[PDB]
Design a protein around this ligand. Structure first.
Ligand SMILES: Cc1cc2nc3c(=O)[nH]c(=O)nc-3n(C[C@H](O)[C@H](O)[C@H](O)COP(=O)(O)O)c2cc1C
Ligand SMILES: Cc1cc2nc3c(=O)[nH]c(=O)nc-3n(C[C@H](O)[C@H](O)[C@H](O)COP(=O)(O)O)c2cc1C
Lengths: 399, 399
């Protein structure tokens, strides 16, 4: 069915339908598909789903000029820990990713691979099964109760990385980015948000290190900016994006309760503009809004009102993508895109609406999403959400 | 004469005329007199002007419940270097400051003393005459051409403070704050703005130190927060304010060109909220707007548009006073005071308009200021600007 009590508003008269160049890509509109894990990859091997993944992505790349950011992909076995999320380290994975990039490109859209490293959010027991460490910034702070029950059942205790093991993760980031560009992706997004490994180093609560990687704003930002620099040297700055969630509390990050959190993120944004001046301006900065502090809470829940992401615009002067409960709020989008370098990411409603861009342009009703198939090993709730036409044929009132 | 082509707007219906408590003071409206050096103090001795200062301050304290922040006062001889600005270290100065505090208080207004230390903005030759050092954060960066011509004529070379000499300045800050409260002031404002000594330590361009006081966001902020902490232990947090100018370029500060400048100030604001939580919330934070990057440029000149002070509101949650070209822009003030904890500082127009608060409330024309007597050893252009009544009697068209 369609979302019951939503009053749609056509947005075809706003800057959301004005072209913008992002890296090497000339987008025809500014609604982007933000990275969405869907757990349909195959075990063993973390292989992109052979039956359904090309279709899913082809469906959402139907409006020409759409920028699509893939589900997070593990850079290596040690960066992983969920059996059904895909990786981007082996030939076998890349043979399936090439087919996905080709299909999106045949539809004249673009595809950016999000590079993912789990840290303490990984399952310690999957990793122990495979002989891998359970990594984080520190070893005296854990993510939550059931993550520590898991780690000790598994007898795979949380480990503070050494500088050498951080260096190895940077090695893997570069290779995975090389693999994605060689297989045909237009660019990569460094996931440094939502409480996963790079964010565990950025955050004061998860990072109690005393070396060069913890203990001050500069040191907590070190591993994220070494990744930016390594990938910029490897594949070019116009092929690299960075995602940040200043106010997120998902996976036990501090959010607005940490009084130093705006300074921690203002520093990263300032270092990025610094490089921009020296010629190496990243393709974009992607921000998760305080409108959504936890993506598994219903739209309207976990909204943080004591802070804003607008400080980033005083520092970084390049394109910024903003995501977080924008689909049910065209009146907020309307104001936000008056800014000429702002793009809007629509997550949960791009899951249920393959043709979201036409529905936004035209002010058409929105298909409800089914939360129960967000993570399911099924085609159902993945490739069978109807376009508006199909939904009318199905009678989702109007027949 | 009145300002020729200004269209006044009455502001009596806005939050600028709603009471607010600031420290121990219950202000009856939110227009404050920001600190304004006027150079009428007497040499030798940096004595507050015996003939005119009580009158000046009495005139501007005429609307009950007005918060007045004094001209900057030197905490000690070594903090000074301008012969005609006042100090707050000797008995002789305090006997004249007591008379000023009494007069303001008889008018049922309040008075906060701004504590001032010059650093590299001092005249090296006045200081050498008196046997004093020419101080700054560093010794390999100078303020400008004529400050270095002065220093070498005077053979009084710029000196990087040692930790012991920083400690001594903190000793003097506490004593000067004790002296002001003992003589009857309601509170003190720490001047950490406009390119003077504490701001020379906060700024990356003026601070190239490698010790505990330079070299990172935390270290550059160290001397300002040790001052905050020392004064809070000495006289109470509800009697201490802090003034900051994130985007100012006056006296050779970096402003918005430094990509790290928002992070440097977001850190200070976050440390202040940190203490606020631990019970010691400062009376207010006072910010100079990017609307005025240099106060000696005519209203409308030197406006920095690539940055905003609004990030401070995401971090500090207490009262904030904002100053910078607000008198000729009631439409900007109207929007800005919709926020319930914002106060507006009016500088240059409180010089020329003793009764500015009534003229703001009622939408009455504004007296032009005479830039030539801002710094003059005269009563003219200091105590003889007319109230609206007097200006009508004088025929400043309308007779
Ligand atoms: C099912 C699901 C999976 C997600 N997976 C990822 C992911 O792989 N990478 C990421 O950075 N964010 C992920 N997110 C967050 C979204 O990109 C987006 O920031 C969030 O859903 C808020 O936007 P929304 O309100 O438009 O859905 C996920 C969210 C959902 C609901
Ligand atoms: C004559 C004059 C003297 C000033 N003296 C000081 C001072 O002692 N302390 C201070 O922090 N700012 C000083 N300022 C700055 C003002 O407090 C204010 O921030 C600035 O004038 C911008 O406000 P305006 O546009 O309302 O005048 C001075 C400005 C002027 C024009």
């Amino acid at each position: 069915s369609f979302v019951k009590d939503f009053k749609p508003q056509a947005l075809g008269d706003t800057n959301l339908f004005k072209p913008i160049k992002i890296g090497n890509n000339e987008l025809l509109h500014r609604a982007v598909i933000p990275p969405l894990t869907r757990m349909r990859a195959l075990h063993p091997g973390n292989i992109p789903n052979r039956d359904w993944a090309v279709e899913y992505y082809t469906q959402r790349a139907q409006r020409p000029g759409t920028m699509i950011i893939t589900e997070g992909a593990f850079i290596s076995p040690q960066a992983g820990g969920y059996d059904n999320a895909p990786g981007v380290w082996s030939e076998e994975q890349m043979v399936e990713w090439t087919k996905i990039f080709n299909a999106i490109h045949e539809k004249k859209s673009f595809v950016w691979v999000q590079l993912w490293v789990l840290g303490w959010a990984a399952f310690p027991d999957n990793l122990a099964r495979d002989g891998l460490r359970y990594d984080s910034a520190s070893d005296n702070v854990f993510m939550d109760a059931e993550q520590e029950a898991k780690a000790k059942k598994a007898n795979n205790p949380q480990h503070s990385l050494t500088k050498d093991e951080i260096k190895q993760y940077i090695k893997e980031y570069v290779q995975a980015a090389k693999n994605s560009i060689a297989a045909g992706a237009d660019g990569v997004e460094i996931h440094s948000a939502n409480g996963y490994l790079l964010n565990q180093f950025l955050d004061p609560h998860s990072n109690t290190r005393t070396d060069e990687y913890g203990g001050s704003i500069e040191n907590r930002a070190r591993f994220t900016l070494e990744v930016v620099d390594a990938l910029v040297e490897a594949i070019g700055h116009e092929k690299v994006g960075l995602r940040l969630s200043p106010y997120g509390v998902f996976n036990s990050m501090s959010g607005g309760a940490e009084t130093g959190i705006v300074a921690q993120y203002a520093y990263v944004a300032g270092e990025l503009e610094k490089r921009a001046k020296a010629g190496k301006r990243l393709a974009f900065v992607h921000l998760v809004e305080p409108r959504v502090t936890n993506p598994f809470l219903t739209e309207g829940e976990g909204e943080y009102e004591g802070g804003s992401n607008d400080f980033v615009y005083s520092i970084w002067k390049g394109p910024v993508i903003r995501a977080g409960n924008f689909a049910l709020h065209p009146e907020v989008v309307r104001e936000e895109v008056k800014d000429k370098r702002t793009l809007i990411g629509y997550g949960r409603f791009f899951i249920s609406n393959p043709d979201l861009v036409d529905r936004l342009e035209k002010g058409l009703p929105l298909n409800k999403y089914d939360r129960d198939t967000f993570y399911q090993m099924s085609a159902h709730g993945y490739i069978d959400y109807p376009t508006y036409e199909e939904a009318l044929k199905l009678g989702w009132d109007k027949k």
